[PDB]
Design a protein around this ligand. Sequence first.
Ligand SMILES: Cc1cc2nc3c(=O)[nH]c(=O)nc-3n(C[C@H](O)[C@H](O)[C@H](O)COP(=O)(O)OP(=O)(O)OC[C@H]3O[C@@H](n4cnc5c(N)ncnc54)[C@H](O)[C@@H]3O)c2cc1C
Ligand SMILES: Cc1cc2nc3c(=O)[nH]c(=O)nc-3n(C[C@H](O)[C@H](O)[C@H](O)COP(=O)(O)OP(=O)(O)OC[C@H]3O[C@@H](n4cnc5c(N)ncnc54)[C@H](O)[C@@H]3O)c2cc1C
Lengths: 547, 547
Amino acid sequence: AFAKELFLGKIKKKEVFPFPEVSQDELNEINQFLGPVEKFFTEEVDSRKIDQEGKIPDETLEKLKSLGLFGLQVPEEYGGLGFSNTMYSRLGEIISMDGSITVTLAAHQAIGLKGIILAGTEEQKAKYLPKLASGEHIAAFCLTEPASGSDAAAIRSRATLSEDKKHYILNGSKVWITNGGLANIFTVFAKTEVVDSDGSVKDKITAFIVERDFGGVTNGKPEDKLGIRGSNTCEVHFENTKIPVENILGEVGDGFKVAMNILNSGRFSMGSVVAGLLKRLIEMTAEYACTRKQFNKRLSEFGLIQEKFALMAQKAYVMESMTYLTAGMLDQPGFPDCSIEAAMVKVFSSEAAWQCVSEALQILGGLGYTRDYPYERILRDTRILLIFEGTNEILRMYIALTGLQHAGRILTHGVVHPSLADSANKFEENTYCFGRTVETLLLRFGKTIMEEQLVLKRVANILINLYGMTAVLSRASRSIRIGLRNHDHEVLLANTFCVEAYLQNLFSLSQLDKYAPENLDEQIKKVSQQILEKRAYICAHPLDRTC
Amino acid sequence: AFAKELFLGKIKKKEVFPFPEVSQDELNEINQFLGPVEKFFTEEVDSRKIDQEGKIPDETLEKLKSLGLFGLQVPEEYGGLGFSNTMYSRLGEIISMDGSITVTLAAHQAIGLKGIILAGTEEQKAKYLPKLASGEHIAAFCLTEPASGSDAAAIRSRATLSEDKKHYILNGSKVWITNGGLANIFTVFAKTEVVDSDGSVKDKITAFIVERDFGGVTNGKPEDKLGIRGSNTCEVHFENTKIPVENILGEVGDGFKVAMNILNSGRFSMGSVVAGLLKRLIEMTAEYACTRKQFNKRLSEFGLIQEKFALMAQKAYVMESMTYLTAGMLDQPGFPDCSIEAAMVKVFSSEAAWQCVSEALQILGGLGYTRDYPYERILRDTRILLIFEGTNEILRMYIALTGLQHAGRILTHGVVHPSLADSANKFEENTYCFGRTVETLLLRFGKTIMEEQLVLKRVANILINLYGMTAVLSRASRSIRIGLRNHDHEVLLANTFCVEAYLQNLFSLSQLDKYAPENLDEQIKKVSQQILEKRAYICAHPLDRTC
Ligand SMILES: Cc1cc2nc3c(=O)[nH]c(=O)nc-3n(C[C@H](O)[C@H](O)[C@H](O)COP(=O)(O)OP(=O)(O)OC[C@H]3O[C@@H](n4cnc5c(N)ncnc54)[C@H](O)[C@@H]3O)c2cc1C
Ligand SMILES: Cc1cc2nc3c(=O)[nH]c(=O)nc-3n(C[C@H](O)[C@H](O)[C@H](O)COP(=O)(O)OP(=O)(O)OC[C@H]3O[C@@H](n4cnc5c(N)ncnc54)[C@H](O)[C@@H]3O)c2cc1C
């Protein structure tokens, strides 16, 4: 991957900078495909009715099955469409208009049946995948226990062999699974004892493809969510579940690798989702500011709405750069390992989504707060993307933790257009200084870097900014060389983000020094310790007096 | 006030560093009153049922009337409680828990009947205030029309003087008037022709105390609000309203000044309302931060949760400093024009509220997004504070130019405790250079500063941070000298805020120079104007290519 090489202080030239280019025929045929898709979301989708009622209408879901979006990444031989990673991102740019169905389909494709394709047996593939991609079967990714979440190694669901050793018995419950109410196939992750030459009785996690027809799998009442009322998040209890031995992934005991790959192979497309959302915002607020008058003038002439529009456009553009570069590096021959960059795209998309949606509702003022306008649904559904597919704080570790281990093992520019000359120099300076800082950080902490949960956050921020800046440089250089329309606008959108990210990175890199007077790590530690040991607020009220 | 002297480069040390101190008898009286108030709010209020149903129950509102809480800033002779400013903030900290009720009370007290006390006559006061503060009459502040929330100098409500000289006739419609559904007294603001010696027929803004019993005033259907569903925000229509000639504030032709003075006196309370929220959150999450297991450890042992808790505590402490210093400035003899400070505290409180509520729901992760937990209600209700009593976006103009206009006319440190030495050494610096910058602006921009609103926003940020830093310095110095419990915790919070605000203000001041390459005023302007002319996102997809 490109991210893993950032820590060593080297930038892989002749790579990333040539932006992924798609030939004409795929683009033409996918416009022919998106015709009906865009039409169907525009006419037949009643977003307000779905959000208010909280139940997806049967006709809409049936038509969605008919268009076959359930198998976008499924290979053609198994009834899928075989769209590449880039094409999935392009279709996800427009799939996000509803807001509720996007989560259901991300659960069905990105994570749900991803396990069968990644590590399932060929017989299991032929048995299940053609029916899953057709839409009759829906996959739900059951991983979390009521007292679980991150660090799923500690699951309390027991699966054990039977006397005849011909079928497994499973008993457990799962709490937060998207589309668990209607799903007919679950990728349950449970625990089972394993025996080896040492005679050990260690317990290891294993996967299980479980149907609702096996019996003993029961569903509870759907949980009344805040924003995406369309999704059907439920409770599943497995009591006395009988599983034939053929329903297992890889080999018994290797559940951690499958779980990690499933989580790490489906977070880049989300980055495009937000981008599409932001487009809709600038398709609805821009107009309003034109039909509303203040200071005897239209709203658009004020500089303080102009800066908000520029910020929204900058976030959308940088987000598109991230998503499409990441989806273009996954289409190379083989199986490249670019799980970090999907995390970068996910984190940046969530942050920019929250900031820009808050600002957009602010521009509409008091009018946007009511439900007559649809800005409620956008704000409520934008929140979940920070929670969805793992929290941002975990991915802040994953970007730093996994990359630094690769960095630790090793220790133990005429490509951009002349118009963007300053951005290349700033990117080179940031990469060099950041490499030196990471080298010093690994030298000083050594192996104790795990507990420095604050340092990893700053390193993750710097890495996300560097990846954003380099993706934007690559996209702008392509747009200039091809001579695409409005190339000066995209040059300005590149330079603004380059200056902003350079300032932020220079701030973050400065406070990662041994003798930095601005290093505010101990103060936060002490204060947080005080509140956490008291478990309430500390400071007494100003009114009270004690001589 | 203290803020107006900041731009000249001089610190009003006598006014703000000796922190306001309440006498023992007054403190005993206020605790005696909060006793029953805290009991009633804790045991009787059913926040979830009010939020879900959207209608305030009759019994709880009647009990609130029995407590006589609708009037507390009312003078004691007019049935009021005669509470001072600091007592209002302290009782706001308590009433902040419900969320729906605080909006109704702010509409009744801070804005609604504030006009009668500020500019009403003795006869009008004796006629209306005793019934208003009793609870059987509620005042609603009608200022906005379908197309006029800001710049009220452009209202289209027509009030004309009848030929008999004894009645005014009023016709108009108002939108987004808090508690307009049940209010029986309106401070309607309209326009009426005025005749002078010059023979002009110009229209001037006038106020009108209007009763529902007059006739021709109709209530529309309540707006279906997003979060604060308890408060009844409705539509009020004035069709042929007859107004007796004695219901005018001040004199005919001074409605704009009365409106401005009403608005500029009720924005410090919600500086501490958020405190009465955030402290509760720092408790409500803290329990959850110790009753869940991850990585085999309590979440409180992680760095990120520690950082979030310290941030929440810091914001709560700074808002306490701002609100109580501002409430102590007002209680001095006379009524100094502290219009800047109230707006400043409001905007800082709103920003910190949004940030901290986002972080707090993030800590609870997937459980917080559920409607069962009360974190959903807090997130939905915290939105209004970026809108209510006018948006915080325009309140960044009063803070920006009300001092510059004051500074324009003029141009045409042993009090702090030694422990907080270096922080004070920063504060003076963060003022001194700042003053120079301001005066340089008054040269370079001449009188054109109004239109270049980005500079105004930057100056607003610098001033807000300076006031926050000086307020926390003064409060921490008082707490050290008196010897309150956990004073070292207060010192740590004060030092953290001083360093953070100094960094942010140095960044803001560094980019206000002409020869600073950190300036983005021109590029943002160009990008925003391009987008606004295009009416939508102008940049195209990267998949599309041109031969
Ligand atoms: C729950 C609620 C409570 C309310 N309470 C009150 C109340 O107590 N009193 C009251 O008077 N109104 C109140 N309002 C009305 C509110 O202030 C809005 O003005 C109203 O909803 C309609 O105004 P608008 O959308 O036309 O505002 P606009 O000003 O048209 O909104 C456009 C946005 O552009 C920006 N902007 C506007 N003018 C300027 C400028 N000159 N310079 C720079 N930026 C600018 C601001 O961000 C503004 O929000 C309330 C509204 C709601 C929803
Ligand atoms: C809509 C939705 C969709 C979901 N989809 C899935 C899914 O596809 N797959 C799945 O497995 N689960 C999924 N979940 C479950 C979710 O990931 C968690 O299991 C759930 O929030 C349970 O609470 P928690 O363990 O995250 O508690 P939390 O306290 O929220 O745990 C995560 C948070 O705790 C802190 N934290 C945790 N670990 C660390 C650490 N090592 N270092 C620092 N801080 C840390 C951080 O603040 C982090 O944000 C979903 C949940 C929801 C609501």
